């Protein structure tokens with residue numbers, strides 16, 4: 626990857642989602658960060674040697690380890706779509722941070738960072754999209770902006 | 778008033794994939810077409826068909842795109858904003874893809890998601906979400922919030 630992209634899963638609950646996201650990360654040279662506690666064990670079958678997976682014990686651990694990272698929070702509280710920012714700077718570590726399948730991201734985090742919160746536009750017919758689908762959309766939007774460098 | 782978008786699943790195998798795709802379709806006002814036989818027993822506009830040929834003859838005017846690793850152009854290389862057109866994104870089965878004859882006779886409409894050499898393919902539901910939201914992006918998400 627020339628642009629450094631990261632996907633962060635806060636306390637993921639369903640291993641099929643994390644496995645599918647790891648597949649998307651391996652397909653795009655994106656680093657996958659898993660914030661413990663997980664809803665599954667790492668020997669779960671539904672859940673890798675070509676994907677960069679990092680485990681963290683807290684969001685704070687991750688924020689302090691990338692003091693220079695550019696963080697975006699994917700949440701329905703966002704007031705702007707995922708396509709409204711540029712993800713092409715070659716000197717930035719970009720993070721897309723996703724909440725738990727049932728409960729989302731910590732409310733305080735969203736409230737303090739509304740200007741970096743991204744919403745996927747949807748009808749009113751559905752509460753949210755599947756976590757792995759949302760992550761795939763975000764990653765391929767950033768790759769689109771880079772005209773899919775180093776991919777084929 | 779709105780772009781008519783359609784997602785077609787050819788003989789889908791895994792219910793969880795079809796369920797997530799139907800959720801994405803309900804989220805975006807996209808019509809979901811399922812081509813039987815399904816691998817499973819059965820706000821989303823879902824239409825069942827007994828064959829792809831039934832679908833092609835029922836939309837003689839439709840604009841059909843086939844989503845396959847054999848495509849030599851990315852999904853973003855076509856415009857999906859014409860308000861007079863029915864756009865179809867057609868996806869293969871999770872194990873074996875689309876009928877080979879279909880791909881060979883339609884390579885000019887065949888779309889591939891760029892990936893690394895590390896992975897054989899993306900999850901089916903993830904691929905369909907990427908295609909739908911690409912079309913929506915091109916429209917600046919008119920009708921949505």
Ligand SMILES: Nc1ncnc2c1ncn2[C@@H]1O[C@H](CSCC[C@H](N)C(=O)O)[C@@H](O)[C@H]1O
Pocket residue numbers: 699700701703722723724725726727728729730743744745746747752753754755756759
């Ligand atoms: N339409 C959307 N806009 C922004 N983020 C979304 C989204 N759909 C799903 N997500 C992401 O997927 C994660 C899990 S879905 C969580 C939704 C849950 N029903 C709730 O009400 O809390 C969310 O935390 C967010 O990161």
Ligand SMILES: Nc1ncnc2c1ncn2[C@@H]1O[C@H](CSCC[C@H](N)C(=O)O)[C@@H](O)[C@H]1O
Pocket residue numbers: 844845846848867868869870871872873874875888889890891892897898899900901904
């Ligand atoms: N990287 C990619 N580019 C284009 N289409 C893809 C894709 N990844 C998955 N798909 C779509 O998702 C469907 C299921 S993937 C199934 C293909 C299977 N691995 C095989 O050997 O045939 C495919 O038929 C295709 O429609």
